Amino acid sequence: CKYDFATSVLFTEAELHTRMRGVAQRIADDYSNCNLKPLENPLVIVSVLKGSFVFTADMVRILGDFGVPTRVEFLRASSYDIRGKHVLVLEDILDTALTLREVVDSLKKSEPASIKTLVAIDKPGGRKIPFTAEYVVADVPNVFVVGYGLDYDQSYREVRDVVILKPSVYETWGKELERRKAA
Amino acid sequence: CKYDFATSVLFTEAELHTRMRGVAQRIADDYSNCNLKPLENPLVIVSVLKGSFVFTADMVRILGDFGVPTRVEFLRADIRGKHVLVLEDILDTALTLREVVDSLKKSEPASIKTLVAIDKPGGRKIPFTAEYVVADVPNVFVVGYGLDYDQSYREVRDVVILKPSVYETWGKELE
Ligand SMILES: Nc1nc2c(ncn2CCN(/C=C/P(=O)(O)O)CCOCP(=O)(O)O)c(=O)[nH]1
Ligand SMILES: Nc1nc2c(ncn2CCN(/C=C/P(=O)(O)O)CCOCP(=O)(O)O)c(=O)[nH]1
Ligand SMILES: [Mg+2]
Ligand SMILES: [Mg+2]
Ligand SMILES: [Mg+2]
Ligand SMILES: [Mg+2]
């Protein structure tokens, strides 16, 4: 494997970008009837921190290529003026769906014109409640991944690819954390 | 010029990335003596929202290519004993970074330095020098690469000078 800390690369940066261009064309078509414009009427991108920052940076630039002007806002996942605006919530990963369920419900209170979700990685086998994202860049099985914004204990977000974390990484670290707690 | 809304393109995405690779090599060299490691001792990247999110996304990936492991925190415009690098898309009067740096310094990081995408050295209202600067801009209003005009145009891939008619008409529209 390309990375000492991973056992498999699931999606390279290039694969993700290719899939994101496909998604951006769908978004561009779906919102074509909305007369989106910079300043007057942008698509409001609501980015769920921390991990979504990389996906958000890449996706708004690709959305711009496809003619979809945006305005970004940032929400903190640890905590979990769109009235009359179209809103697209962006999450790095969707797993139990508990986070996005709450984020969407919260935003709905402010009466946006519409609200949809776009996720880079969907783990469809991880749900604790029924939830479907309108737009999904890639599906992964129930394995633990890092990269493209996704962390293990705040590290590895900067890895360019989505990779399966090698178990000795969290076994080693977990022991060190537990050793520090007893010392 | 490629963009309807811009008078000229100052720095293309490719030119910014080329400069960022140069800066990342200096950062890798400057922090080599710190024994940075994922989990145990990452370089703490403090990203000043909102506009720095694009620069931060690109820059942490480049730093990773150069062997500099990071963790990110976001500040809106657990660090004791850690090295901190503050990232800002643009530095002008320096009043934002002065306040950010001084507030972080109260948590006693091991060190604190600043990295900005765009420095406007002629805009200072207090003296301030960033340790790393990707590019310099003179007395012009730019958008793109995270930088906005009234929250739009952050998604433009290049740093561009906004056409005056854009903010003339919008300013008039905000009646
Ligand atoms: N790095 C990583 N994180 C994973 C994974 N699966 C769930 N998570 C936790 C993601 N979290 C829960 C999503 P859910 O739909 O279950 O509410 C959201 C992101 O966590 C907050 P942050 O972006 O790390 O600051 C994974 O495979 N890799
Ligand atoms: N888009 C754009 N913004 C500019 C420019 N010059 C100063 N600014 C103000 C940006 N900043 C002031 C930096 P200072 O050192 O003066 O404290 C703050 C950035 O604005 C906050 P946000 O990123 O837009 O949420 C410019 O040329 N283009
Ligand atoms: Mg997240
Ligand atoms: Mg996480
Ligand atoms: Mg900023
Ligand atoms: Mg601004």
| Residue B50 sits at the chain A interface (C-beta within 8 Å) | yes
Which one, of B52, B73, B89, lies nearest residue A72 by Cα? B52
Reduced DSSP (H G I as helix, E B as strand, rest coil) percent helix, strand, coil of chain B, to 5: 35, 30, 35
- The full DSSP string for B103-141 is HHHTT--SEEEEEEEEE-GGG-SS----SEEEEE--S--
Establish whether residue B148 lines the binding site of ligand 2, counting it when its CB lies within 6 angstroms of any ligand atom.
Answer: yes
Residue type, A5: F
- Cα separation, A177 vs A169, in Å, equals 12
DSSP state of B69: -
- Cα separation, B101 vs B127, in Å, equals 14
Token pair, residue B142, equals 């730019």
Token pair, residue A145, equals 């991944």
List residues bridging with A135 in a β-sheet.
Answer: A118
- Cα separation, A153 vs A173, in Å, equals 9
Q: Which domain holds residue A141?
A: 1-183
| Residue B154 sits at the chain A interface (C-beta within 8 Å) | yes
Residues within 5 A (CB) of ion ligand 3 = A 48, 51-52, 77, 92
Q: How far is the CA of A5 from the centre of ligand 5 (A)?
A: 33
End-to-end distance of chain B based on CA atoms, in angstroms? 30
B148 is in an annotated binding site: yes
Return the ligand number nearest the Cα of A141.
1
How many domains is chain B partitioned into structurally?
Answer: 1
Q: Which residues of chain A are within 8 Å of residue B74 when distances are taken between CB atoms? A: 49-50, 53, 74
B76 in Cβ contact with B84 (< 8 Å)? no
Interchain contact, B71 vs A152, CB within 8 Å: no
A119 in Cβ contact with A94 (< 8 Å)? yes
- Cα separation, B136 vs B122, in Å, equals 10
User: Out of B65, B69, B154, whose CB is closest to A155?
Assistant: B69
The CATH number that applies at residue B16 is: 3.40.50.2020
- Cα separation, A116 vs A27, in Å, equals 10
A143 in Cβ contact with A164 (< 8 Å)? yes
Resolution (A): 2.0
Burial of B135: CB neighbours in 10 Å, binned 0-12, 13-18, 19+: middle
Give the method used: X-ray
- Other C-beta atoms closer than 10 Å to the C-beta of B97 total 21
SS3 state at B47: strand
Give helix B13-30 / helix B52-65 axis angle, nearest 10°: 60
